[PDB]
Amino acid sequence: MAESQVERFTFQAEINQLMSLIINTFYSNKEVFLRELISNASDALDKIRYQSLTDASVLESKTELEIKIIPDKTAKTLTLIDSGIGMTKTDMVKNLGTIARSGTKNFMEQLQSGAADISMIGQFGVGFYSAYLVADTVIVHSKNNDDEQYVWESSAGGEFTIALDHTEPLGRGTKIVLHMKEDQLDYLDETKIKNLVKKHSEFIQYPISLLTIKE
């Protein structure tokens, strides 16, 4: 018998609103979700990279600085793994939903006024939530040098959970799994995703591997 403690958290009110907005509104061009996944991976990779300049020991958990992108049609998932800095449990609790952040209300206001469109979400520091343009459920596995591996999960609806992660160890970094909406499964088509990764990684300084799963 396996045993696991799972903690449930409620999204901050504005974050809940933003998630409903991203989910319950039709947006015709959703490819920003991929730009954001890759940009966030790159940011996390930058952070560990710069940390390694002043402290070489930070890389001992995983030497490679790389991104892996894994479309899996059978599983209806898109997975993006980085070997960046990773996030502690508290990092994920604080930054993946409980704490109100500086750009949330401003983004929502600009969405409604037309000052911003959905593709500009990243500028407001809430680009993670763009995953809900294409996914019903998002799972974030993360491993920071200062903590054990944890797994965050949400299907929106106002709550997330976080638990000690007993799945494949990352060494260091973050593995985000998007459980794709039935209407957005075309994002798992091999050629489509390969080419979109090319399109949205033009300024990325880290190796990317595209691993297409066949079952």
Ligand X SMILES: COC1=C2C[C@@H](C)C[C@H](OC)[C@H](O)[C@@H](C)/C=C(\C)[C@H](OC(N)=O)[C@@H](OC)/C=C\C=C(/C)C(=O)NC(=CC1=O)C2=O
Q: Which residues bind ligand X (CB under 6 A)?
A: 40-41, 43-44, 47, 82, 84-85, 87, 91, 95, 125-128, 140, 174
24 marked among binding-site residues: no
Smallest separation (angstroms) from ligand X to the CB of 38: 9
Output 39 or 73, the one with its CB closest to ligand X.
39
Smallest separation (angstroms) from ligand X to the CB of 166: 20
Output 73 or 105, the one with its CB closest to ligand X.
105
Output 40 or 149, the one with its CB closest to ligand X.
40
19 Cβ contact partners less than 8 Å away, ≥ 6 residues apart: 11, 129, 132, 156
State in Å, rounded, how far the first CA of the chain is from the last one: 29
Please name which of 166, 178, 144 lies closest in space to residue 36, comparing C-alpha atoms: 178
CA distances in angstroms from 7 to 4, 116, 140, listed in the order given: 10, 35, 14
95 marked among binding-site residues: yes
Output 160 or 187, the one with its CB closest to ligand X.
160
∠ CA(20), CA(136), CA(199), 5° rounding?
A: 95
128 marked among binding-site residues: yes
Output 12 or 212, the one with its CB closest to ligand X.
12
Q: Let me know: does 206 contact 66? Beta carbons within 8 Å.
A: yes
Smallest separation (angstroms) from ligand X to the CB of 131: 8
Bridge partner residues of 10 (DSSP): 159
Smallest separation (angstroms) from ligand X to the CB of 198: 19
Query: CB nearest ligand X: which residue?
Result: 128
- Please report which helix (H) or strand (E) contains residue 12, including its range: none
26 marked among binding-site residues: no
Smallest separation (angstroms) from ligand X to the CB of 12: 12
- Pairing mode, if any, of strands 208-210 and 67-72? parallel
Q: Which residues are annotated as a binding site for ATP?
A: 40, 82, 95, 128
